[PDB]
């Protein structure tokens, strides 16, 4: 019984929301589409540090995710390839806190404080086999569902 | 034992006459079920020669002529200018297969000399022309194949695929 | 035997190449050229049919039949392809030299490792074992070489000496082999050890970097910057192409694989970055 | 004894290996590999017997009623089989390799695992009391490996350390350097502890994306793309043949298995992959 | 112009002598040149009927001989139990290749009939016993390539290659 | 007891068949019709039902035609043979849950007209879907017999 | 205790980041770590390392707190924002090459402040050429994710 | 030329006393190094007489003998009681085969005849009973490889060798 199929429909149900331009929604459909084959073959950390690196986390993208953890009514805001990117880094840090990979609080005081976004790498860097395991069919999911629920270009 | 007249199927139309056994028999090798000729016989290095309409040897790898094989001895009046030779029915370049064949086949082919005076220049000569096609239907196939305008009324399917199966390489010289 | 033909032949860059992999993540450039498992550059085989079927369908058009016979039928196919093509083994590249003590000067080298020729050695005894065929002076050639493994050598030239792409500086010592056929403008060809000449093999690529400019403001646009791999041309790829016993593959072997010369391999077409030349062994060595 | 003849033999990749093991929805792979009980790749007896009936089928077609009494008929059967093969054990896949503690460079090496050599022991022992046949050579080659179990172990070499597939840290132990390598080649075989073993063989893998080009203008066409999953070459499986007593048993086991070397496993075959050279054990150890 | 004629290259005695002249001009464009032979030329659809070793007319594609072209002008007794052609010199087959040619030929092949009362089955047939590679050698790579085992001592490699470059199709008769 | 089902398989089967105007859109149906059913009950329904919608391409248009479907049978699915065969299945398995009582056609037709109302649909499938797999397999399996009887093999 | 290049990278970058203070030098060695990769594939390892020593300026005073950066966690780069984020580079560089046992620290600090030493390493590097070459674009690969992920582009 | 003859090695001591020639030639086919014999000959068909053990021919593909080929020649009072066979050494059926013959070969097998007065069933046997093992260590692999006991002290590989090897078929009388 399948409810990775379940907290995935929250997270898209959070993220669709969360995205006010269309271009927006397009262009994390596309991140949904790709990105999944490339955390199964290149793996998770080194696909973490890509999306990382195009999600430009500073305090104020960070504090709009931050947000959306809780909010219903926050959203992601910049240009349509950050959001992208930062709504599938939030896709997976969603994954992480439900399932108890990680502390919800710690990633929130992580997210918080710039000192503390690489312990954040590094305890995903300690957990990478047991996350590339686990989050496969979410990941599969989220794909299905942006590809349904979302037009192309 | 049984013996293959080859005839070829160019745009043109010296093929008045060159075989009075063209049943004789009952059965061919090309033949239709309603999805166009089957089993088409192609001779590679042969050149047609319209002008004395028949084949001539080339020793070009990818000169060749498409024709089809019906049972028959040619004109009566031959041994003298064609080529016959006989072939286990698997040294045959048969395109467009339905199975079979009995495994021993005397064909015989329009065959002509080379011509060993001019150099040997040709041409691929793909077929168009529709009115051309009509009378080589009348003049072939309806002549050979009556079961075509006998049964089949949807003979569309066999003037296309005339079309999209017969082509040859000849000299125009 | 298993096998009607089977024609090896030599893939020469005339232009620069680029046959595509598609922008992985644990790579730096984000269009990198395919490699093969051992990090190697090659050229796919379904890349090497697919540009190879077409250019025969384009420019033999009275012989659709027998090339869909051979390389097999695009909608509805009906049964298998007759003819195969093995993935393109690198054979040598190109390679920039800073030699000096040496007579003639050389703006760049070919260069080859051992495994390379220990893959081409075992193309040709499989494709030699499945096929009534044997090129018994390639196969001679190629183990001549092979005898020294373990040692940078020199096949022509007096190169003791060198650093090849700036980075590796080598050690070499000649053989008198000189394969003048593959190799023809007299270029030398260096065979290294393995570990040494996967790093000179691998900075010996053409990473030309390019941009897409903001025709309003008429500067690069964000985000429009990227990395590109070519291989560099003269690049010499070793490739097997198989036929099954056929009527069609006698007319293919005969007539098409020998009025085939140039075609056009992967992307970049528009760029000048495809042409290539096709060698046929059966009339190299 | 239950069989006239039990024959094991290894399966050595010549080019890529691609048996593919069907399509699902939850797959994240278009085509991928057949899978083990425990995650390895394997090759379904399915699909040995099918390629090996095939390729002697046409090589030996004078012998049609041998091979159709040993691995059964086609048109009408009326009776079992005399012919067995059981499904291929992956023995040794090959991993790229980064030296350190060690001495030779080596730029591969093989490596297996101390649950792969369990499901070969296991065919072993089963088969030696199946069959006239013992294995005692192989046999006490397997068990004074595993008697080493849970320590990462080199065979032939003194590596002593190294980095596989570019991120796995291995410490190995030589295991003795007077106990004949399994492996007929000359590069160094490593037994590794499993938890970690999985890991290099999964990365060991070679996915490639292929894409479909719409062949009346040189762009994609709607849904021409996925990915695909091969073993490398040089990957060997472990499996066997076996035969109950018979007249064209003894045939098959006299004159087939003595002139069959090549085959073609599995598909990808115009893309040249699936070449597959046999080497039984009779005559390997 | 110039006239060229193709001796075959088969394991069975017809070899010895088959036109007059060996040289007759001062060209052929088969090249021995310390590196193998070169130019070889090959014809399909023909087997060799080493009874009277002869070129015979077949369709199989399949079916080839490889031998070499020298000029010649054959006994000057025939047009009757030969084939002439004037090609255009880029329709020929050539394989181990050099260069190209004098742009329009004339060809003797060793023509022969079919006999349609006996089946040909050809076989493939390579160059085996290695004393027939010696007489081989000298019943022709000696009358034309007079230069040989004079200006050159690569003659085992004249052997290898000719070991490796000539197989054909035999009739089975 | 499931007999009803054959009667129900029946007229949604005539349904997607007169929508399915080319006959390229009724063999890629029939396609369908064939694996879909080995997917749902090898792998589940849920991931089977994703995969349906992601083929599917649910936009305005198709969904227009899917409820009209419902209601007319003059409609027609256009676009793109393979999305209108996934949707054609799609319209098969919404068909089962409405025409049975599984999901009232009052909500689906809702949802199937308003965006924030699809992900509720597909949550409510989830919900249930142990109830479909299990009830609606005759079903299933009857449309894959219509479609390899009445559509001709491509 | 052997670490991955990534985890090597997320230490290395760890004491870079800390150790420079004024964020206008974390944006310029933001950008050295976006280019100097592609350099040193395109020139070479040895060239592009001597770049990096001479843009660095060492300066013999701020080559004391890189050295101290190997050891303490409370040192800080100072000088100019060019100068320091090329430094913090170097740091990087010579992270990985001690780290990995590839070169020893004592012979790299000699060689970088003494200069009869300099030059027996342009020695040196080039015996180790394969073997730095082969592994050291990964780790600069992940210097640059993590730079253009916690640092604001500028 | 080549040479050979069959010294198969059952349980049955009829075995030293086989062959004039111990060497005589250089290429001895069946070796030993360091993993063991290699190139084993192995006679299908034909089972051992152990009353003056010889190979008697049964029509039986499921009986064996599986022994060295050694070069010699039996015993000079032979060849009126053996098989002399000229054979293209790729007929031989050769268990553990290391490298490559020489293309043709002569081979002396020790013959018998039926002798059709009582039925010749047949019983596979193994090799045991260690003080065969040992006798035929020294009486057979010393006085052909005598090297061993001076270069390979691994005798425990070659009597594993034996004991594991050599199974062959013998006439239950």
Redesign the interface.
Known sequence: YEEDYKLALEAFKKVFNALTHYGAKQAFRSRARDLVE?IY??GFI??FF?IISKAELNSDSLDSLISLFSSDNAILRGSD?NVSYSAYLFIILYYLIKRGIIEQKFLIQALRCEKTRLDLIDKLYNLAPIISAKIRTYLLAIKRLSEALIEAR | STQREYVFIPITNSITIDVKITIGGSDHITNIDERGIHNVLVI?GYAVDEKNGRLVPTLD??D?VKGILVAGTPQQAQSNDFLTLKLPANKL???RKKGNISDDLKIYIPYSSPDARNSMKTK?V?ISDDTIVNNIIKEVFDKIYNITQKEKVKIEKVKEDIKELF?YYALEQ | ??Y?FAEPFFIHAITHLHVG??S?????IALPFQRD???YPTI???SL??AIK?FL?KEFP??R?VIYKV??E?ENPEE??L?????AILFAIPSRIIEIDSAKPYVWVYVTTY?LLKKVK?YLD?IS??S?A?F??LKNKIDTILAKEGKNITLDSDLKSAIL?????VELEALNNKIP?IINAGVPLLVL????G??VIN?SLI?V?RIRIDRDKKVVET?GLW?EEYVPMKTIFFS?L?GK?S??S??FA???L?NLRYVILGGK?TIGKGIVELRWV??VI
């Open positions: 490339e073959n290149s080194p696909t890509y390839e | 590679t790898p990818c060749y370049y048969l395109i691929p793909s082509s | 035997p298993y009607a992999s598609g992985s993540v644990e790579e730096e498992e051992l990090g796919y085989a379904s049919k697919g077409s369908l009275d012989k039949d390389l097999g695009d298998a392809s003819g195969t093509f093995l993935d495994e075992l499989s074992q499945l009534n044997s018994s002076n792409n700036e980075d590796f500086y056929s050890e393995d570990s040494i996967r790093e900075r990473r970097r985000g990395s097997v198989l016993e009527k069609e006698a007319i005969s007539c098409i020998r077409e059966k009339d």
